[PDB]
Design a binder for this molecule. Structure first.
Ligand code: CHL
Ligand code: CLA
Ligand code: CLA
Ligand code: CLA
Ligand code: CLA
Ligand code: CLA
Ligand code: CLA
Ligand code: CLA
Ligand SMILES: CC(/C=C/C=C(C)/C=C/[C@@]12O[C@]1(C)C[C@@H](O)CC2(C)C)=C\C=C\C=C(C)\C=C\C=C(C)\C=C\[C@@]12O[C@]1(C)C[C@@H](O)CC2(C)C
Ligand SMILES: CC1=C(/C=C/C(C)=C/C=C/C(C)=C\C=C\C=C(C)\C=C\C=C(C)\C=C\C2=C(C)CCCC2(C)C)C(C)(C)CCC1
Ligand code: SF4
Ligand code: SF4
Lengths: 42, 68, 81, 191, 156, 205
């Protein structure tokens, strides 16, 4: 069990997990606020 | 009767050789040779590695500054 | 003299350069300036091809055998024809 | 001290008139730089104290301000007016030549003496009464001069900046402007 | 600089007209209720509300009917460059400041080599929020003089 | 010790002499003395401005709505005008005296007591220090000199801390509350009190 977690902590595996989460987040935001050329809140 | 010369052991030293790979760096003294004729007595071990992979070499007394 | 091979006083007498000369340039002579009590020596620089492997096996601070490439002769160019 | 709570920069240990611990740029590190600065300081003080009332009092009379009193030289046929009177030598090349030779020579007479103390405090023919009699009073006499002289320089800065902010104005004209409505005429309205 | 507002520029309201007509051209070939007809319609509405937002948030359009950005800092236009820009700089430090903390954190170990190819996840979890306040934390380091070193560079 | 997070232990440096030491500084923002020493005043000056600040926002809108008096919204107060008040000059004026009082306080922390040995008379005694950096009570700053400087400082400052800590939060409420509701703070309270389960930030969005 410990060895599995350690392997999951090596750099490449984190990268896909981290970037994959990042890709999902940006895609969602563009799905809800599309075209987004300016920041018209303030 | 004469005491050993140079640092004793473990004492961090600041390297002063200009062409070295660890100039202005710090290593650990592992042994000093007590033969007066020996031309580079202080055997310095480091933490990094030079481009050859080596991580130790001899040094001269005046190229070693004994930080504390 | 075709190429110039020079050995400094840093050398620790490890006999790693001599064993790595492919054309028998360097050789070992007695000294008194090291624990090993021997320093390398280059008395046959004519046949020195210039293959820097002689000093890719000198394990010192910078280097203790150094090779400067000068003019080229028919053996320092390793011509077989 | 000027800034109660900061340590004195080591090279300002009184030992001078008008010295309150103020050298943030360390301009006076070199003693030679230190002494020459005193000269320029007292001179910049000395000239300024003369110039401020000469800028104001004419405006307090019918005469034009410190800007108008230089304007005839702009036009080629300029002739001056002192107390309104057209002085004959008021043409620009005339006064300029008179100005140049007199200013340079007397100011060169300065450049050719190195006491160096007299280069700040000559006295003598410049002290026809001899206020320097009481060294205690004379030392305080420098203080009054220094602080007043520093006061003059700022007033000079106010006069000039108010001119750039308000072209073609007078300091008393500026003063009265504020004096109408101080709360709607201020340095607030520039920016 | 002569850039008329997009809500006014007839060229802007021309591009909006063509791209709608171009899509409506591709639509009068499928069934009025099949899946293609809906996806086409979805993109049509997305386009019209795209153009409206560009003619609403004060984007200035040239003679190309296209928006132009004024990055000069005229604070009538702060949400074009300056506001998104500050938003980036906040994030960029957060990435920068966190990573610095970790390398320092694992620096004092037997071999920092192993703790970087095999990242310590728990330690990187108690450090991941410290990047919320990086502007405050760093600016104190700069004043205290621990953000930089002076002449001890290689080795230690 | 009754920290903020029951299970969690308090950090080692928040020993507890500072009033309101509820072992709370998760991000490692106070693990250096000179850091922590300069941070305490910030909370003290912020909270005090945030104690009066909410009341000025609060009380003014309370009296206006009920009808006793009339004043603009604190949101709308910035553009107000009666006479002889160019917002230009006021900014300069307020910057001046505040600049004067803020600095002399700054010099006190930078150099304790190096603020009440000078020439200017008649006042050179009180502005020494309260003997506690963030509490400069003197016989002018505490004209009802009503402190013993040690005992209640544990038990009364702890009131002024937990008072301020609340007040700083409250002001943050109005800024966001006015940012979304477009209305007055009590208006936000009055609206929510009307139909609480329908007047909520979920509906405000
Ligand atoms: C320090 C706290 C402080 C805060 C949070 C504000 C915030 C505000 N001021 Mg303000 N001011 C503050 C201090 C000061 N103001 C002003 C001078 C002004 C002016 C002239 C105006 C404001 C206005 C405003 C409002 C801006 C509208 C907005 O943000 O839409 C979200 C808002 C309530 C504007 C306003 O009242 O619009 C309704 C406005 O015209 N302020 C001065 C004197 C220079 C201040 C002194 O510190
Ligand atoms: C580093 C330069 C750079 C910058 C500053 C931007 C900036 C932007 N891109 Mg962009 N992009 C870039 C490189 C860059 N991109 C590259 C290299 C590609 C190709 C992979 C794209 C492909 C791309 C797409 C497909 C989209 C954006 C979008 C956007 C907008 C983001 C809106 C948002 O998230 O809110 C913004 C103007 C979105 C948008 O609407 O643009 C206005 C969008 O849909 N970009
Ligand atoms: C170009 C003009 C000039 C020059 C050469 C100097 C030169 C000098 N000033 Mg000085 N000063 C000036 C204008 C000038 N000041 C003005 C306009 C002000 C008013 C803001 C001051 C206010 C001032 C103070 C308050 C102090 C000096 C001091 C000094 C001395 C060290 C710095 C140096 C001799 C310091 C000193 O040692 O006094 C001699 C000092 O304490 N000056
Ligand atoms: C260094 C100091 C200084 C300088 C350069 C000037 C320069 C000037 N003054 Mg002046 N002035 C000064 C100090 C100074 N003032 C002082 C201290 C006073 C107070 C007594 C005056 C009172 C004064 C009056 C009352 C008048 C001038 C005028 C003038 C201008 C004409 C000068 C002239 O006609 O011949 C030089 C004059 C003589 C040598 C005599 C000239 C720009 C005139 C003016 O306003 O020009 C339109 C004018 O009528 N000055
Ligand atoms: C209110 C301003 C004021 C004060 C208090 C002094 C005070 C002094 N000046 Mg003085 N001075 C001033 C304005 C002033 N000056 C101006 C405007 C000029 C131009 C001069 C030109 C001047 C010279 C040329 C000399 C003095 C000298 C003196 C000193 C002896 C008299 C005394 C310290 C004399 C001095 O140093 O005495 C030894 C000296 O040589 N000053
Ligand atoms: C030396 C003293 C001094 C005095 C008594 C005044 C007095 C005055 N200035 Mg002024 N000024 C001064 C120095 C001074 N200034 C300096 C050194 C500068 C350059 C930064 C200026 C730049 C300045 C501008 C740009 C303006 C004034 C204006 C004014 C008038 C409006 C009220 C006021 O004080 O504005 C506030 C002045 C200041 C805050 C300057 C600093 C004063 C310190 C204490 C000296 C008033 C008559 C205004 C005016 O004419 O009203 C219509 C105006 O527009 N002043
Ligand atoms: C913690 C990460 C970190 C930090 C704080 C810095 C900081 C710096 N780098 Mg840099 N660098 C890094 C990682 C980092 N580097 C990595 C991984 C690479 C290899 C691609 C580089 C390659 C690089 C080059 C080539 C240059 C710098 C330069 C600089 C300096 C100017 C900033 C700049 O230009 O950014 C440069 C930014 C990049 C090149 C983008 C890549 C950085 C990645 C995206 C960040 C990685 C963060 C890390 C993986 C996250 C760890 C999280 C942890 C919890 C596990 C500054 C001292 C420049 C310099 O010398 O200026 C003085 C310069 O020329 N760096
Ligand atoms: C609320 C409570 C319970 C206290 C309580 C106390 N204050 Mg305090 N204070 C408050 C609001 C409050 N204050 C507000 C709103 C302000 C700003 C107007 C201040 C300004 C203030 C100062 C300036 C001082 C106190 C002092 C004291 C004392 C005691 C701890 C004094 C003290 O501790 O003297 C020893 C002291 O120096 N407080
Ligand atoms: C000063 C302040 C407000 C002052 C208000 C004033 C003067 C109001 C003035 C006015 O209304 C009047 C009077 C009249 C109006 O006509 C004019 C205006 C101007 C409108 C609020 C502070 C408000 C400040 C707040 C809310 C600060 C919150 C900070 C938090 C939560 C930080 C927490 C942490 O830092 C710790 C504690 C430990 C870390 O380890 C973890 C983290 C989380 C990082
Ligand atoms: C305003 C503006 C502008 C301009 C700008 C500019 C001009 C700027 C400059 C700038 C500059 C001139 C800068 C400089 C700098 C320097 C330095 C020196 C820096 C440094 C930094 C640092 C050092 C950092 C660090 C860090 C941190 C803190 C975070 C992350 C991590 C690290 C560690 C990296 C424009 C027009 C564009 C537009 C409008 C706006
Ligand atoms: S270059 Fe080659 S031939 Fe020459 S000394 Fe080195 S190893 Fe020998
Ligand atoms: S390799 Fe270097 S150290 Fe070794 S014997 Fe040769 S010259 Fe000497």
């Amino acid at each position: 069990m410990r060895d599995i977690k350690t392997y999951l902590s090596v750099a490449p595996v984190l990268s896909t997990l981290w970037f994959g989460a990042l890709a999902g987040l940006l895609i969602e935001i563009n799905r809800l606020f599309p075209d987004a050329l300016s920041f018209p809140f303030f | 009767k004469p005491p050993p010369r140079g640092p004793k052991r473990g004492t961090k030293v600041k390297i002063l050789r200009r062409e070295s790979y660890w100039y202005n760096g710090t290593g650990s003294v592992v042994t000093v040779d007590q033969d007066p004729n020996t031309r580079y007595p202080v055997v310095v071990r480091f933490a990094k590695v030079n481009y050859a992979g080596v991580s130790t070499n001899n040094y001269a007394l005046d190229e070693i500054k004994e930080v504390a | 003299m075709s190429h110039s091979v020079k050995i400094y006083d840093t050398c620790i007498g490890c006999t790693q350069c001599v064993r790595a000369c492919p054309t028998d340039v360097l050789e070992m002579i007695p000294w008194d300036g090291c624990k090993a009590k021997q320093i390398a020596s280059a008395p046959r620089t004519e046949d020195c091809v210039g293959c820097k492997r002689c000093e890719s096996a000198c394990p010192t601070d910078f280097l203790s055998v150094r090779v400067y490439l000068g003019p080229e002769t028919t053996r320092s160019m390793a011509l077989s024809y | 001290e000027w800034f109660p709570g900061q340590p004195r920069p080591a090279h300002l240990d009184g030992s001078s008139p008008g010295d309150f611990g103020f050298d943030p740029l360390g301009l006076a590190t070199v003693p030679e730089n230190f002494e020459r600065f005193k000269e320029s300081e007292i001179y910049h003080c000395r000239w300024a104290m003369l110039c401020v009332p000469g800028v104001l009092v004419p405006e307090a009379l019918g005469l034009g301000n410190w800007v108008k009193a230089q304007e005839w030289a702009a036009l080629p046929d300029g002739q001056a007016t002192y107390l309104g009177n057209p002085v004959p030598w008021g043409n620009l090349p005339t006064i300029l030549a008179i100005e140049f030779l007199a200013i340079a020579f007397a100011e060169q007479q300065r450049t050719m003496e190195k006491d160096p103390e007299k280069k700040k405090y000559p006295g003598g023919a410049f002290d026809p009464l001899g206020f320097s009699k009481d060294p205690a009073k004379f030392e305080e006499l420098k203080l009054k001069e220094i602080k007043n002289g520093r006061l003059a320089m700022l007033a000079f800065v106010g006069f000039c900046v108010q001119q750039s902010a308000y072209p073609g104005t007078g300091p008393l004209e500026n003063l009265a402007t504020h004096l109408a409505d101080p709360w709607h005429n201020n340095i607030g309205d520039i920016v | 600089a002569g850039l008329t507002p997009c809500k006014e520029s007839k060229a802007f309201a021309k591009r909006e007209k063509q791209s709608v007509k171009k899509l409506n051209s591709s639509l009068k070939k499928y069934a009025p209720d099949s899946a293609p007809a809906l996806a086409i319609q979805a993109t049509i509405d997305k386009t019209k509300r795209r153009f409206e937002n560009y003619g609403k948030f004060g984007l200035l359009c040239g003679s190309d009917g296209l928006p132009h950005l004024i990055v000069s800092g005229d604070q009538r236009h702060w949400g074009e460059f300056i506001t998104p820009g500050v938003l980036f700089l906040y994030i960029a430090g957060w990435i920068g400041w966190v990573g610095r903390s970790y390398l320092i954190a694992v620096s004092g170990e037997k071999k920092p080599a192993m703790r970087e190819i095999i990242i310590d996840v728990e330690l990187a979890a108690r450090i991941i929020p410290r990047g919320f306040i990086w502007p405050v934390a760093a600016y104190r380091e700069l004043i205290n003089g621990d953000l930089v070193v002076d002449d001890a560079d290689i080795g230690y | 010790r009754a920290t903020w997070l029951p299970g969690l232990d308090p950090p080692a440096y928040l020993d507890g002499t500072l009033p309101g030491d509820y072992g709370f500084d998760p991000l490692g923002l106070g693990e250096q003395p000179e850091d922590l020493k300069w941070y305490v005043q910030a909370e003290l000056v912020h909270c005090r401005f945030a104690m009066a600040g909410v009341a000025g926002i609060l009380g003014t809108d309370l009296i206006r709505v009920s009808g006793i008096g009339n004043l603009p919204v604190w949101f709308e107060a910035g553009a107000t005008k009666f006479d002889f008040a160019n917002t230009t000059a006021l900014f300069f004026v307020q910057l001046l005296l505040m600049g004067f009082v803020e600095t002399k306080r700054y010099m006190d922390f930078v150099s304790p007591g190096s603020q009440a040995k000078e020439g200017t008379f008649l006042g050179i005694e009180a502005s020494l220090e309260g003997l506690q950096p963030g509490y400069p009570g003197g016989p002018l700053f505490n004209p009802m000199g009503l402190a013993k400087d040690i005992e209640n400082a544990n038990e009364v400052k702890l009131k002024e801390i937990k008072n301020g800590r609340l007040a700083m939060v409250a002001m943050l409420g109005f800024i966001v509350q006015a940012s979304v509701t477009h209305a007055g703070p009590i208006d936000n309270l009055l609206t929510h009190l009307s139909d609480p389960f329908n007047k909520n930030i979920i509906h405000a969005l």
